[model samples]
Target: SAQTIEATTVSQLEKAHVRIGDTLRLTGTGMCNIRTPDSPFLPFDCSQIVWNDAPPLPLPESDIVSKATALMQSVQRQLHPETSRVSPALRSAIQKSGMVLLDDFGDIVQKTNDLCSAKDDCLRLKNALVNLGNTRNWETLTKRATAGKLDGVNVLLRPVSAESLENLVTTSTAPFVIRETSRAAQALNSPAPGGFLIASDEGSVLVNQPWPAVSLYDYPAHEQWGELRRLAGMLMHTPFHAEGIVTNLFTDANGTQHINLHRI
Candidate 1:
């Protein structure tokens, strides 16, 4: 099973005494995305990675270690505060569930923007959007009106306005999937107000709000999309269906421990 640990700061990670295989499910970390070396967007080997400026490639082991740690640190600096202390709440819940943490779905998120003024602001906005989707209420309405009328929720393709990442709002749009009859017709008469679908493309996406940090999409739903791109995956230790094996653990010259993920 994938073990969970919360480290919103570098110091926290150090204190956690993390093992190489631990899954990192961090949240609210703005612009702290870590990409694979082959990442189309931001790779860990950036010239900016070494502040002093020089050839980016073959970055000094120490610089790479420092930058990698910094990337990890920066992300921890951007997460949202939780109900309990900080990291253990989610850990216990997942441990009880018996799911394993996975890495093959994709690489860690690759975001390049900072939409929030504070660490948890974007997460707050994400929660607000999810709040619009009243689950049981919608279920009841659909149940009484037309049983399973609303197939999938719909969100606006465009945003009306953005008051920081958390204060942002969007409208909903229509859907179409002819082969199966668009989500609309099957439940047209089902008149239950579709509270929230995912009208958060432009804004939410601008900030790789993955896993615990949501916006246009909620969990499971967000999980679906997270697996669909380079935006999500890695370190947010939730039970994902990946069969990758962590075979090698090597510490570089700078003393940064590297965990090799061998996927099926």
Candidate 2:
């Protein structure tokens, strides 16, 4: 028999000023940049920005296990106060949007560190491990688990023996693992084989496959050229367009002035 779950309405559901797939632009420092009923959020509805199919970041060609390990290390470096960088408005947006800041970002960092650094210590596998296979690296999975406050889990990696390899046998769950691995592999192997480049970081994948063309001024020749090149290396694993806010910022020759494209 199939398990049936009941659906019920909540006491209340608040409507958001913004929806998924909104393109947003913001400039300067002030409360005005913040989202409000009157002002609304930039990239007001997620659709404004275009999304390209791309795998999550850090690429995958470098051995799935190693790539997952590097991701954990990279994330720690990114979130470290000394290494992380964000604009005032973006930081504010992160806070206002109710994103979680880990009680011990270090613990999660340590877990990743352990996974990346662990060797010959099966028990060292952290509670955060998942058998989701190759579609994701441990870092992203860990991030998801942490965002949901799920900690203290482990994923067992069975040892591969010569007999198993000779028998042309694979685990039942190997398909899922292969699927996940292939996605990551594509990301690293050829970021932009034909279209969007797949890349991921701590927050989200920068699927730059079919990146929309911004205004000429919005993307200068030098930067635009680099972006175009980088785009070529991005991997696209899905057709899901970007469903998050987007922004454009520019700096002067001396890097004095700044510009932005806020959606609202």
Candidate 3:
């Protein structure tokens, strides 16, 4: 889906007039210095100018959930070989809602804020993808819920539990009772982050034994280096090659001037 353009320098790349999806094969160990496409890439020798690639990200602008579900399912499968028989209910909700939620990892205020921030991200991605999860729900299972607009994808926000704060060592802490939900409805925040995500109409469980939680941000680095390489390929507008891996991009004296192609 892209033209393979090989260049010894940024100027040579400009000679080809690179577009967004063109596959770039720079013979030089280039950095992100292709601003005018004709300028020479001189800058960071290492870290963060990282370029990666993956399969065709078939998001429909209206759906992050569909692909997200696929990722979640895909992630869970690759990580755990399906130890649990339960089918993730979140996937069902995603069919109609097209959004995914990350379990809060950071204090009440922090966790709450993190939830909102991720919500904002989903909105932006949804907007950009308007080009991209589920078509449907979180309140019922969590016993609390708030809705947001993500077109096809949704990031359902569940109410923070009436319980504790968000510190890494919350091991000793006990779940608190809201006193009212009538039944001490369990706290929303779990001490551990990654685990298989499964929500049923009956209830939800964060399984640790079977699968590790991949709660966004791609917590596990090697887990999806496949996607990483593909992104590098997409930026090059070609397929990702093992040799074409992009490793660094610096911005000040550290970075002459590097624009990461992975911007939405």
Candidate 4:
């Protein structure tokens, strides 16, 4: 069961030591796919060294570590006043529940940032994005919303400006499909006021703003008409349902031909 786990602050890990047998768990929305990897090597001891991993990756001849480390040290000193002593008053509350607060976070976060800021960081992030493609990345980000992985993630397609919407409606070469119906009708009454809906000759799409980020009244809506491709099905973590108007290059009930969809 996913519940609101209270967040514990730093400064607690220094007092307790974590051992190998201990079972560790993390609780949060984005903890699954997104994680900062921790190095197995720590508290450098010659006895602890293993030769199998190969000589650890070498630091650059002109390393920035010393400069960055000095800057961070100076910043920490400026932030903390000498009058403030370490005490339980500075400690975070420990809640008695199924949740266990994660510790050693500052170290984990700092090291993770260092690794990513390294020249190689962009490559990994880009590779992940390329593997994800456009829509799957959007869906995964949405899934990181309310529900846990089991129910799938929530998705909110943000409304781009009307000009952007028009560009999409008029330029795409493939039809886009609107996966949800009832939601589309409700959206039509308010247009983008509640959220935006747009369609190209091939498909329709809906964009919604997530709560807290923006109020419902402020949400923008966009509808494009053209041929737009959707995210590949294999990438979706869960099944999605979208509904809206579907336009085609054929006569309607009145036998009227709809061909203006391509001339934007």
Candidate 5:
């Protein structure tokens, strides 16, 4: 059985500190009367009201980082050992960025001091980790040609031959690449072999790929467009679509929110 409580005002609910999984039911004449009976009142009907709680609580900053780091490590372990062929720079970038990125979130956490106090900031951090994990996986899977023998074709001798190129292009989606673009409009219009570029700016390409596509103005170009194009091509050639799963206000059966990456 669950407990029931009456909340006459919004302040009552706030004072209760209602957790993520609690139930809220608003009833009776005091709750139902509206000044304009004909006007569209509350979206929810008061007569039959049983609102299942859907609110996330403030989590300790250390816990947030710990969970995110654990997921990152799991993703790192799943990468193929041969991912090194993508380039020393790419491998270095992934490792270095993963370390510093989460640490950078600490500033936001410190400032807010609680998840609920700054929900948007918490969401940003959660999504960042998830996006990073999926991006790395995408790079690992697409960096090199797979064994043709698995597909019942001979590929041990001529990996990049004309026949092999034809087979891959016909069987798999072609990689998208964008080059020498300083403007977002130009980048968007540029022929993307994979359908999009990583990101771009007035003078260089932004290698970082943030979710919801952060404004390019906030990111500085650290690499030339050509290099970014190559890396983007590698990711595009990978077979899986990458995505991040960030916990929102919704809570699970265990009453905890978790962030993760998935390949679709």
Candidate 6:
């Protein structure tokens, strides 16, 4: 049975002395993919993992180890403002296991910004973290939704403003897909209070706001679309449902298709 795992806090993780072989069910932050013993070394290898019941990878690099350790210590100190003490066993476990606790999702985002700003070698790692966060939210929402998936529900696609649409057109250099049904097009053109549906072979995602706004980048490239769809299939629960339309169009060589999507 897939039991719901309680959210693990940064402080609790540090105190528990988590290690490489330790299986963790992380919530609130995002779902993670565990590296198998036979997995190949690749930049996006971890992204392919579903992380149902698995352990952390062995021998993460020194940089990852250091950052994970520093972040954990910082979190532990912040969690216990009045105390300077953390268990020696905890520090020992971290050193011995070659892994660091990064329980807070915000910390992962912060690290992404930091790495991207620095243009460091670890940017790939941070991007993986971002993808993990996105994957987890998508999974949790669809899994708990009323339809038992995203396709069957009436989802509210977050609308991008006209100005932002233009910027995406101006900046992007490749073609992408913009899909919406006639109903979605009507709402986009009229400024009416309605949402659009996301079409996938497995299921569709309903995006209503105070949910994050959708961006052109939200749609993955054709090469990565299969991966995105796989994650969508894993969204077995959500809180909403709807019937909708789909309009598919391609962009120009300079990626003008995204702007055209908003206009349609």
Best by lDDT: 2
Among the numbered candidates, top TM-score falls to 1
Model 6 per-residue lDDT tens digits across residues 208-236: 21221332234443222333333232221
- TM accuracy, model 2: 0.16
Q: Whole-model Cα lDDT per candidate? A: 0.27, 0.30, 0.26, 0.23, 0.26, 0.28
Model 1: lDDT to the true structure: 0.27
Number of residue pairs clashing in candidate 2, backbone atoms closer than 3 angstroms, sequence gap of 3 or more or interchain: 43
Q: Candidate 6: misplaced stretches above 4 Å? A: 1-71, 74-80, 85-205, 212-236, 245-264
lDDT of 1 by residue, 1-264 (tens): 446555343345445554545554332221212232122223211111111111112211122223233323323333222332225665455447653221110111111012222334334333433343344432243242233333222221122221232223111000101111222122211211211111111112222223333331223321222222232222121121211333444444554433333332
lDDT of 3 by residue, 1-264 (tens): 457666554346445654545444543331110111011111111212222122122211212222333333432332224232224785456436643333221112222223323434333222311211232222221122223332122323222311111121121111111111112111211112211111111111111112223421242322233332332222222212111212232233422323223211
**lDDT, candidate 6, residue 56?**
22
Report the lDDT tens digits of candidate 5 across residue range 54-135. 2211211223333333333322322323332234665466566442112222222222223223334334333432343343
**Segments of candidate 3 deviating more than 4 angstroms:** 29-45, 48-264
Between the candidate structures 4 and 5, which one is better when assessed by lDDT? Answer: 5
* Tens digit of per-residue lDDT, candidate 4, span 76-123: 332322431233333233222222122222331233234234444434
Best-to-worst order by lDDT is 2, 6, 1, 5, 3, 4
RMSD list, candidates in order: 26.1, 24.9, 23.0, 31.1, 25.4, 28.0
Query: Which stretches of model 4 miss by more than 4 angstroms?
Result: 1-77, 81-209, 212-240, 248-264
- Please report, as a residue range, the 10-residue window in candidate 4 with the lowest summed lDDT: 27-36
lDDT of 2 by residue, 229-251 (tens): 24323322222222213233322
Higher lDDT: candidate 1 or 3? 1
Worst 10 residues of 6 by lDDT: 255-264
User: Which has the higher TM-score value, candidate number 4 or candidate number 6?
Assistant: 6
